[PDB]
Design a protein around this nucleic acid. Structure first.
Ligand code: 118
Ligand code: 118
Lengths: 268, 268
DNA sequence: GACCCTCCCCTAAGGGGAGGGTT
DNA sequence: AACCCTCCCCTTAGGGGAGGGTC
C-alpha cells in the first residue's frame, strides 16, 4: 500500500511517517529505486499499533525505541511511574496556589503582595540577642552595635551583596516585649567579645514577600503570609527573618524604602 | 549596579536577564551607549519578584507579558485553572494504566495483547442480523450476503480502506446459539432486499486489541479486554465489534491472519 | 585578573511551505 | 488534477561557546 492510503489506515499524518522513517522507528517494506516511493504492508500496521500503545502512556521516542527493539528492560518502566507520581503532586500544588490567588484578587481587584518560594544558602553572621520594649528603640540601638564590632575587629569585610536581617524568636507576636536578634553577614571568622558573637546560619527554603513604604504597615505583611501557609498546606518550621534593602542609609523619602519578609516552611 | 551583581541579588543567570531585556520584559534602567553596558537599580528587584511569582504558577512568557500591563484582564487565570485540572485527570489515568501494565507483565514473562484507545467515525453500512448455532456455520454462510447485494445493486462501490465487521448483540459472551449481525461499509445508499438492510453506524471511542493467527483462540482476546475495562475504571457502552483485516481471501497460511477486537468504552 | 558585549547554533516532535517529477 | 519526493526554516525558555573590547 502507498503512503497516502497507509496514512488513512492508521489515521496519522504523512509527515509523521516521514519522521518515523528518518528516526528509524518504522521503516517501509519496499522503496522504489528511481522514484523513491514508500510501500507498506500489514505487519507495519501490527507495529504501529504497538507504537501508539506505548506513546499513549507518556514514553518518549527514545524509550519507545528501546522498549520495542531491545530486551524487556523492565527498569525503564518503573522510572516512569515515579516521574508521574512526582508530577501529579506538583500540579496538585499549583491548583491550590492559584485558587488562593483568585480568592484574594476577586476580593480586592488589586494585589499589594506577591509571594514566591526561593532558596537562601547558609551564611556566616555576627549577631546580638536581646529583649526590646519597642521596635523604634531597637532601630536606635543597633548602629552603636555596628560601630563597636566594625572598629574592634581586623579585616571585617561585608558580603556582596549586603545581607542584614533580624530574627524573631517569639511564637506569637506582641508589642510589649520582643525577643529579637540582629544579624549581619560577613566573610570570615574572628574573635568574639561583649554581647555580640559570630555564628553560622544554615540554608532554608522560604516563601518571601517584599514590602515597600514605611515600617508602620509591616504587620500587614505578616497577616498575609500567615494566611498563605494556612491555605496551601505548608508548615512553619523555623523563626522568620526580616531583611533590610533600602532605608535611611541610602534614601531620604520613607515612602520609597524597601524591605523583605521571609518565612521558612515545609510541605505538610 | 552592574549586571553581574544584580544577577547575584536576583539569584538567576545573566542569559536570563539578556533574554528578558530582548523580549521586552524588565528592560534595564540605564544603558551606556559607548560601551553598551547594563545598569540596574533597586527598582528592578520588585518587578523581578513579580515575574518569578507569576512564573511559579505555570504561566508562559507571553501570558506574563500580557498580565503585568493589562492587569484588568483576568480570564487568563481561569483559562489556566481549567487546564491544570485537565492535566491532573490525564496523569491520574496514565498512572493506573502503567500500574495495570506492570501488574500484567509481573507474573507472565511476556504479553501478546497491547490495548490502545482510538476514534472511529460514523459510517454507512449494509447489514444482516440473525442467529447461528456456531461460528463455523457463520463463516460458511457469509459469502452469499456479499454476492446478493452486488447482484441486485449495480454500481455499488466499497470504501477506501475497507471496513468489514460483525456485531455481537448478546449481553453475555457465549459459544453457541449466538445472536450476530454482519456489516460492511459502502459509499452510497441503496434499497433493501429481504433481511438485508441499509443503515448508519455512529461514531465511537474504543479500546482496541489486534489478534493474529487462527480464529479459534479469539476468545482469549475477549477475556483480556474484559479485564482492562474492570482494572482501569472504565464502563462498556455498546456491543463489541470484530473487524477483519487479513484472512483466507488474501493468504493460505492461517498463521498470518489478522483481526481486531474493539470495545466502545467510557471513562466512568 | 575580572567583566562585559554581540553573533551563531542547539534543544522534542513534528508543521508549513517552495520547487521539481510522473501519470 | 492527483500523488509523491527532498530541502529549508519554525515553534519553548533559555544554554553553550567564540571572538573581541572595557574596567
Ligand atoms: C551595623 C548595624 C547596622 C547597619 Sb545599617 C545597613 C548597612 C548595610 C546594608 C543595609 C543596612 C546603616 C544605618 C545608618 C547608616 C549607615 C548604615 C541598618 C539601620 C537600621 C535598620 C537596619 C539596618 C550597619 C552596620
Ligand atoms: C461481503 C461479505 C464477505 C466479504 Sb470477505 C473480505 C474480502 C476482502 C476484504 C475483507 C473481507 C470474502 C471471503 C472469501 C471470499 C470472498 C470474500 C469475509 C468472509 C468471512 C469473514 C470475514 C470476511 C466481503 C463482502
Amino acid at each position: 500500500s502507498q503512503i497516502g492510503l497507509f496514512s488513512k489506515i492508521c489515521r496519522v499524518t504523512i509527515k509523521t511517517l516521514h519522521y518515523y522513517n528518518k528516526i528509524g522507528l518504522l521503516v517501509p517494506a519496499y522503496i522504489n529505486p528511481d522514484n523513491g516511493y514508500r510501500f507498506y504492508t500489514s505487519d507495519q500496521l501490527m507495529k504501529f499499533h504497538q507504537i501508539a500503545s506505548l506513546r499513549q502512556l507518556g514514553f518518549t521516542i527514545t524509550e519507545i525505541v528501546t522498549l520495542t527493539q531491545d530486551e524487556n528492560s523492565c527498569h525503564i518502566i518503573e522510572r516512569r511511574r515515579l516521574e508521574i507520581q512526582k508530577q501529579i503532586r506538583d500540579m496538585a500544588d499549583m491548583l491550590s496556589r492559584i485558587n488562593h490567588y483568585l480568592q484574594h484578587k476577586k476580593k480586592e481587584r488589586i494585589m499589594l503582595y506577591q509571594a514566591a518560594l526561593k532558596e537562601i544558602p547558609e551564611c556566616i553572621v555576627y549577631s546580638k540577642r536581646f529583649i526590646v520594649p519597642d521596635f523604634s528603640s531597637y532601630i536606635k540601638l543597633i548602629p552603636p552595635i555596628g560601630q563597636e564590632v566594625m572598629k574592634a575587629n581586623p579585616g571585617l569585610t561585608l558580603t556582596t551583596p549586603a545581607y542584614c536581617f533580624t530574627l524573631y524568636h517569639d511564637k506569637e507576636y506582641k508589642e510589649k516585649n520582643m525577643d529579637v536578634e540582629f544579624c549581619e553577614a560577613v566573610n570570615d571568622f574572628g574573635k568574639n567579645e561583649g554581647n555580640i558573637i559570630f555564628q553560622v546560619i544554615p540554608a532554608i527554603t522560604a516563601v518571601t514577600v517584599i514590602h515597600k513604604g514605611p515600617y508602620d504597615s509591616l504587620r500587614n505583611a505578616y497577616i498575609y503570609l500567615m494566611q498563605w501557609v494556612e491555605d496551601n498546606g505548608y508548615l512553619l518550621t523555623n523563626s522568620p527573618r526580616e531583611s533590610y534593602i533600602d532605608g535611611i542609609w541610602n534614601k531620604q523619602d520613607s515612602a520609597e524604602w524597601m524591605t523583605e519578609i521571609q518565612f521558612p516552611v515545609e510541605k505538610v
